[PDB]
Design a protein around this ligand. Structure first.
Ligand SMILES: CCCCCCCCCCCCCC(=O)O
Ligand SMILES: CCCCCCCCCCCCCC(=O)O
Ligand SMILES: CCCCCCCCCCCCCC(=O)O
Ligand SMILES: CCCCCCCCCCCCCC(=O)O
Ligand SMILES: CCCCCCCCCCCCCC(=O)O
Lengths: 242, 278, 52, 242, 278, 242, 52, 242, 242, 52
């Protein structure tokens, strides 16, 4: 026999092993692969697809209505429409989206994200909106004067119903932590703020609905990636399923 | 030799993420990349470079940890049958639906074609479930649909002339074996909008695709057990094809053979008191 | 691969007869994100207005 | 010694292993192989051979008579001769044939099947018969009008004593399940119906036997195969044989 | 084959120490190698040959035992979690700061890029800590930040569908596994002159760089333990890049997450009574 | 299976093993290596950097003052300034330097060492100093007449503030033991003596400081090396750090 | 290497897919001691006076 | 370490293993091989050498006399001299010969056997003898008329003292079983009969010895072989030899 | 993993194993090999060096005197000087020599041996001596007449002080046993006799010392070798050395 | 030999240094039966009478 020295790690089972193993049915010949539409080779093809933010997460809003941010006729200038901490982890609105639910399976992320907004008011309803991205270091911008100092787009309601604010990868490091784990101070990875402001006002003809909606949508850009698989927090069980 | 070259496949993970080209300011009425129309169903085409002034970035990040192979390519628990000492026999129905982590990972796709590596860890314990010593061989028999099931520890079905079996020791290394894609269909189905039978629309046969079900694993000790044995059955999905991505499961799973959920409070993400502050 | 950067380079060696015995595939396969992101009959170039 | 790492599956015995193993008699030199007629390399050579259906499985019929379906002079038009659920599994008439007994050793099947019928009446006995195959979805056809809507052959009794109804592989999937396992809903794989009808009538000269027989025979076509070995249900023992 | 040539790297340790050239006497005002100026911050350039009359010495000594790879390239203890029998669960926070020998070796550098080989030795003992017999599988689960932690021995988190796990026997060979350089940063940092968070300057977050922290290892026995288990966690640092050497740690370590020291008596080397005798 | 014979050393864990081992994250792709200044490939690059000797180790001197050897105006001729046993081990002044702290991690050493001295008196302060290295065999030299018989440099205070005494590798063997382990008689490896003497005197203008300092510095020459890693004596703990 | 003197010559053979699995590197890499010993704008040759 | 999977049969000791194994004296250099006459490479070289049958196995005959079959002057015609069941196994006369003792170590045999007979009467003693081989199926031939129907030689006593009856390999199968194991019905392998008859008579001059002898000898032909080593029945021990 | 079958001898430790094994210090670089005089590659270089026989082993002779065989003026003719059984083993005079002490470490020997004798009488002392080697089979030769029948040299005392009797390898077998193990009858390997006789007489001038000495010396010839290492009998201990 | 008939064809691979370590030899060696069956000075061809 060939002299050998089995070493440490002998007979262990690692769940991420990449080893060949004997087939219990070595003569089996599977059914052919047929053409099926929509073959996926990499889950970042899904992450680049837009999905709707559960953006209207105010206490008391249930169901489909959590998907429409209110936008109204204002009686005061430069008012705020929306505020959102840029986070792939945690439990805020981004966490339940396609990108957010993929991020639940991963520990680290990098790359640019885009947010596409669609206005749902009547044809006759006009308005201009400021969408701002504030890099980290401080708090959420308090007024439109402070928010405009950051990356921002200005949206004119019109025939083209939707706008994109690209949130570019602006970062001290090549990767950030998905989670906000407190004991581990993963707030170190704070990724900034997204805020929405009235650039002029929502204006309506007499007797029209004085309230309309924005449907926010989010997706990853082609420069985006995830590392380190991890267990999804909110997919649990207390018993074996029967 | 070339014959041994047949048993080696050189395979490479070197696909990179997209880079960034430098851009400058644009003042025009020609090019409006930020104006979109979500009504078409297309995702926005606007990129970094067309929205702000960018620098150049050479791509350096890989994508391989989110390849479907890497995402599914690890072992997960799928079955935990308990062999008691009264009959020294147990079984596990073969599907990936008892334990939620693998099931929820599979819920990202409709059709999935794969092979499986199974890994079985046996553990002996007392009635109060404290670890204990017991050296014994056990037998796992694959019993496909229509093969008679063993009814006792000494049933002559355990002959295993045509059912494949694996024999291993309770206190030895874990049994491990691979399995090809066995469906009569050309892929497995994670979800099924139909009935298991013609001439029948019973709710208990809605969503039941019996081509996902390849039968049973049966378990005995080769002698009568002195202590109870717990088998932990792990599956690693490999050589994986995936089609038709889905909205992933969000509500907790409740039943093994259907998608029933509570749906009492319609929300997923947590609440706040005001949309303009955190 | 004794290292290029983000290139894992593997020789999968299967010792058993059936292809199903082989370890997991490490190739990166083609990504066609546009079957899901741009699933529309008429292409809309980034610099154009989408409608009309 | 060469450093090694024995992994999981060490020292297990799998009954389908394909491994070399030391020979307890390494110097033995066997007797030569001689020519013998009828060498078999693949059990589908047996499955393509016709065998007789135990088709007359009515309660009370014993022995050789279970192999002859009665055919009589009818006093009414368009009557039914036979009905049979197309099934390689279970315990009906197909289960005891050569193809059916091979199917007892396998879990899955695909391909076309043929049924050859031989009439056994006197030379002077005439008749025409309709043999129908109904694809699944419903019940057994109730009358000859409904059965004729399917695949069917029409048989004229004459010098050529026998007919073939080819039951073609008509199927949503590449393979079906052999068994009808209830807990697993293998009725999903229902494969249709075979029925036999009087196309005209059996007609005899005065004082001839007013009853004759069909001997049904079945075999696999060359496009047929089996997968997944499994234990035969009805080959059991309660004790070691002595 | 060339494909197998890809899995082999021929690597050589044959760098030698500097030799010595013979020299003769020098009486001149031209060359003054012994006159130096430490104010510049440069180390003296004077060599043997220019200070005394030397012979020739052919270099024969290697330098490889002080290569950074060789200096770090051995295993050291970094974690010693104890699994009690009450809950049969324990964990270890992953960093090289509980045990002083590896930490002090790392303190010679600022930034360090490496891989890790981990080795786990499990030992069972009684309440009075005397070795005892216990054969049982255990599970080590890597739990990265944001993954829910197991709270019991039977928690369904140990499914491990996405967390990697290693299963091994308490009385089997030691579990061993490798790990690539996992930091979000381009190196690890041995010392950090900053705060873990924006908008916060709490002393408990000074010197805390959370990109060094990749999470937790969690430990259970697969049944309830009959005796306590001690896991010893060894790390060997390999494929090592090092930047920016430092004054090495001299005062004893006191805390896991900061550099606090006593500093009561300001000296390191021992004293004598007179500088002109020993 | 290939016949094998696992031999002795099977399943052992040696801390200096050089073996490949399965990666628990085989799909991970690390962040690129960026340029950082000051990459170190070998700890003898550190050992060739000068560091300050804790040379004024007299009982009662604390803190920064342990780094300055006193030098005074003498009232007698040929007086001694300093004495030091040449030792990389033990606990004397060389033990706390960069070279000495590296030597704490190693068992054996070879090569030449240099000592650079910097005078810190006023511009107007003059003096000449004799720096001697005495090879082993006897005691520390008792007077400047005996010390001068060895390797020595003579230092003139002036514009160039510093001097080097190169202590050359003078040795019966290719390597010496770092430690002075008594039970093992590692005093066998005694490496000689370094002494400092007034060659003339320190001379000052009227009313200047009559005391100044030498800052001694030490480093390894390019012909130096270490063998056999060993544990550092003075880096201990009584408890796990929390 | 069945022995040259102080030359260890090793064929590192990694059996696993990821480069991180490989054993430790035995190469001697370049030493630039002068980035730490002579970190000065103007080189000072040994035979010269340092200041001026 | 190279990943491995030790399988079934690990650590077993099979007595017929063909494996290399570490030498406990790896530097030993044996004495040269010298020439010795009579080197044997194959035990069928021994089986082709004639040896004497213990043919006169009648109850009461002891010693060397068991090697001489009596031959006498007959007073009646066509009498029988000898009878012998053709068997390499069992315990009859063939079992103690060189061929028979080799057959004790083997389970199966094939090939032709020859029997050489030497007459030992006086020079003046004449006779003719019939040596018969009867293939199996029935009993021993009862008279010379029945025996002559088989393979047979007719021996004339004369100057050439000896005769050969070649018993040719006449057999349904390529091999026979050596043993006559009853529980296993190895009488299936019955190999026929050898009988010896007076073809004329033994005739002597007046007053000569009226009794002489045949010495029977047996050996294998070059077409002969043995299979399956087995333990020798009659080489036993009840205790360890001291 | 590669399928394997560890066989018998797994995990054993054999003291003569020739296997590679992991180095506990894989980065160590030893000191160079320097030139040293007298490098030995094979212990038969030592065995070919002459050493002094402890030849005067008479009861009562102690110390250096055991190295000088007495030689005297004889008052009778043809007297015997010395007798010695040719043996590398046992405990007689050859056993303590260089060749004998090497033979203590080995089980078997072959080759020619030479014995060199040096006379130590005065310059004026004359004599002739017969040195005989008797091959085995009988006893020690009893008189010079019997001893001369063997291999022998005749020594004339003179300017060349010394003589060689070559004891040639005369032997039935290629090797002999070193030991005289009684239970194993290693006296089978008896190697003959060496005897010394007065060929004429020792003759002296008046009043000279009437007794002088022979110093016997022994060594192996270049055709000599040893096999089978074995433990040295007389190098023992009752306790661990402290 | 994956089978010719009565031909066993073996590659004896010895892993140890000493030839004595090798497994058993499978060669068929020359048979000279006639040194034992025909050990006579004068050959006697089968068709001849032996004596004279
Ligand atoms: C034990 C050997 C044969 C067992 C075959 C196991 C194949 C399992 C594939 C399961 C695919 C369907 C998953 C599901 O229905 O949720
Ligand atoms: C027993 C036959 C030995 C063949 C195995 C050679 C080593 C496996 C090849 C691994 C290839 C990928 C390794 C890598 O470069 O990262
Ligand atoms: C268990 C698999 C993933 C675990 C990742 C372990 C990587 C450890 C690197 C530690 C580097 C920082 C050291 C420190 O902070 O002191
Ligand atoms: C299982 C495939 C066997 C390949 C291993 C061959 C031996 C390893 C190579 C070691 C190379 C360095 C050894 C040395 O020369 O010091
Ligand atoms: C570890 C090195 C692997 C070399 C062993 C290859 C297989 C052994 C050769 C056996 C040759 C005779 C087999 C046969 O054909 O019957």
């Amino acid at each position: 026999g060939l002299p050998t020295k089995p070493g440490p790690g002998s007979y262990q089972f690692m769940t991420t092993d990449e080893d060949c193993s004997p087939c219990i049915l070595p003569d089996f010949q599977p059914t052919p692969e047929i053409f099926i539409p929509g073959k996926v080779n990499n889950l970042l093809e899904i992450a680049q697809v837009e999905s709707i933010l559960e953006a209207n997460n105010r206490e008391g809003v249930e169901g489909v209505e959590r998907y429409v941010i209110p936008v109204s006729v204002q009686d005061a200038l430069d008012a705020q429409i929306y505020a959102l901490r840029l986070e792939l982890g945690g439990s805020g609105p981004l966490s339940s989206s396609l990108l957010g639910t993929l991020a639940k399976h991963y520990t680290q992320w990098s790359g640019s994200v885009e947010i596409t907004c669609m206005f749902t008011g009547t044809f006759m309803t006009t308005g201009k909106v400021l969408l701002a991205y504030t890099p980290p270091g401080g708090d959420m911008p308090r007024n439109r004067e402070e928010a405009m100092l950051g990356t921002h787009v200005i949206w004119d309601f019109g025939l083209q119903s939707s706008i994109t604010l690209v949130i570019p990868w602006i970062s001290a490091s090549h990767f950030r932590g998905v989670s906000n784990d407190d004991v581990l101070n993963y707030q170190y990875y704070a990724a900034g703020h997204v805020t929405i402001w009235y650039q002029t006002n929502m204006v309506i003809p007499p007797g029209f609905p004085n309230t309309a909606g924005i449907i926010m949508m989010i997706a990853a850009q082609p420069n985006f990636s995830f590392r380190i698989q991890k267990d999804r927090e909110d997919m649990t069980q207390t018993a074996i399923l029967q | 030799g070339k014959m041994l070259k047949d048993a080696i496949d050189k395979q490479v993970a070197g696909a990179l993420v997209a880079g960034t080209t430098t851009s400058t300011h644009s003042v025009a009425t020609d090019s409006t990349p930020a104006l979109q129309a979500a009504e078409t169903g297309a995702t926005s085409t606007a990129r970094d470079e067309s929205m702000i002034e960018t620098r150049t970035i050479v791509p350096t990040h890989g994508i391989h940890e989110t390849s479907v192979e890497s995402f599914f390519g690890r072992s997960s628990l799928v079955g935990m049958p308990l062999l008691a000492t009264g009959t020294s026999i147990t079984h596990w129905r073969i599907d990936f639906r008892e334990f939620v982590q693998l099931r929820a990972k599979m819920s990202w796709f409709t059709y999935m074609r794969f092979d499986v590596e199974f890994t079985i860890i046996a553990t002996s314990s007392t009635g109060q479930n404290v670890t204990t010593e017991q050296h014994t061989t056990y037998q796992v028999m694959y019993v496909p649909p229509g093969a008679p099931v063993p009814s006792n520890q000494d049933s002559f079905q355990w002959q295993s002339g045509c059912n494949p079996s694996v024999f291993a020791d309770t206190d030895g290394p874990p049994a491990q074996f691979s399995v090809p894609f066995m469906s009569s269909a050309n892929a497995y189905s994670t979800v099924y909008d139909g009935y298991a039978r013609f001439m029948d629309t019973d709710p208990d046969r809605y969503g039941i695709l019996p081509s996902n079900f390849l039968g049973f694993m049966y378990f005995r000790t080769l002698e009568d057990a002195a202590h109870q044995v717990r088998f932990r059955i792990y599956a690693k999905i490999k050589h994986t094809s995936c089609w038709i991505p889905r909205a992933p499961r969000q509500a907790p799973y409740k039943k093994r053979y259907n998608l029933v959920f509570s749906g009492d409070s319609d929300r997923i993400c947590s609440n706040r008191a005001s949309l303009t502050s955190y | 691969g004794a290292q290029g950067g983000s290139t894992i380079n593997y020789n999968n060696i299967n010792y058993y007869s059936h292809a199903a015995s082989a370890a997991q595939n490490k190739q990166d396969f083609t990504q066609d994100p546009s079957k899901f992101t741009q699933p529309i009959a008429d292409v809309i170039k980034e610099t154009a207005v989408p409608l009309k």
